[PDB]
Symmetry: D2
């Protein structure tokens, strides 16, 4: 169960990296 | 057409933020085990 | 706890929608 | 430049599939409660 809690933190960190990268992609497309 | 992609990325980012909040909420409930 | 299991199924379904849409976006960009 | 975006979307999709498998693995472990 703690292994699950630690996995969730890990997954959340990965998702924040993805959000940052999608925002970068949306910027780049916006720049033309 | 590129504006439609941009707008969809914006929508996908908001959905992903919602998912992150829900998974954070789960994590808190597991720390209350 | 079952509420958590049901939330995870819900989140997974949403993520599969997102994957499908990103693939559509990658197609569209590829088409020029 | 557009090929770099496409390649990054491909990388992000593979990361999201990995996340989906990990969350499915959690879900199974919660059904074994």
């Amino acid at each position: 169960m703690k292994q699950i809690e630690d996995k969730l933190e890990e997954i959340l960190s990965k998702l924040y990296h993805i959000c940052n990268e999608l925002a970068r992609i949306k910027k780049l497309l916006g720049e033309r």
